[PDB]
Amino acid sequence: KQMVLQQALPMTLKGLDKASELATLTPEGLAREHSRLASGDGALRSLSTALAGIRAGSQVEESRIQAGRLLERSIGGIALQQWGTTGGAASQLVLDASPELRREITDQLHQVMSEVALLRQAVESEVSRVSADY
Amino acid sequence: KQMVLQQALPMTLKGLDKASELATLTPEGLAREHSRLASGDGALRSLSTALAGIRAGSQVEESRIQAGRLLERSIGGIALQQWGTTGGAASQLVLDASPELRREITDQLHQVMSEVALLRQAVESEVSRVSADY
């Protein structure tokens, strides 16, 4: 099931794309769409799903470690990878969070996206290397 | 890592596509390209990789069981899923196989492809159901 995770690396890029809003998410914006941007097609779920795909499917060790660091990084005390849940601790944390934790998780999410931008360059070129003759 | 296998179902279809030659592979043809059609972009590897992706990533139980039955089905005594290996027991079996085992594995591979054609209808519509609004 290894090689299958690898054959899906391409899909990873579209996940990263659907996560762009997070690069400028504002403290007030998180409060409002808290929910939405966390499920379905939400930025938060797409980001973590994409990073999990890079972590499982890339053949470049640096890309796997980076994607793993990012999924485990705590966003307001909770790991980025929890933030993509349909009504978990993330959804409530937001309502119950305060103008303090909110600027915090927002700043953190912005930092993730700039590291994601480097990650994505490496992944893009692995996807194009893997599929040259295909 | 569940949801990630699911987000890749789409890639599965392209694997099934790269496997079409197998639907009419002839006994003499297997003997010749034995190798090639078993690695890299080969039909055999693409088929098993695709079926493994449907088995892990589909949310339709019938599709997972079918894909699993097909990966485990023996093709000349060896499981379809071994046939996609770069120099294993499949590659040699062919050279060492005989006009008897060769018509056999060929007939079997044809039967797989016709079942794959049903499988692919279900998967296509799950991929399109999953991504309507996306």
Burial per residue of B91-121, b for 16 or more beta-carbon CB atoms within 10 angstroms, e otherwise: bebbeebeeebbebbbeebeebbeebeebbe
> Structure resolution in Å?
2.4
Write the DSSP string, A86-115. Answer: TTSHHHHHHHH--TTHHHHHHHHHHHHHHH
Query: Strand ranges (DSSP E) for A17-95?
Result: 74-75, 78-79
What is the three-class DSSP state of B51? Answer: helix
How many domains does chain A contain in total?
Answer: 1
Q: How many angstroms separate the CA atoms of B54 and B48, rounded?
A: 10
Does the beta carbon of A130 lie under 8 angstroms from any beta carbon of chain B? no
Q: Closest to B49 (Cβ–Cβ): which among A7, A45, A133?
A: A7
Length of chain A: 134
Question: Cβ of A15 under 8 Å from any chain B Cβ?
Answer: yes
Burial B3-35 (b: 16+ CB within 10 A, else e): ebbbbbbbbbbebbebbebbeebebeebeeebe
Domain with A134 in it: what CATH number? 1.20.120.260
Which chain A residue's Cα is nearest to B8? A8
- Cα B74 to its chain centre, rounded Å, is 12
CA distance B103 to chain A (A): 29
Neighbours of A31 (CB within 10 A): 14
Report which of A125, A109, A132, A123 is spatially closest to residue A58, judged by C-alpha positions. A123
* Residue span of the structural domain in which A123 resides: 1-134
Q: Give the CA count within 13 Å in the CB-facing half-sphere of B123.
A: 32
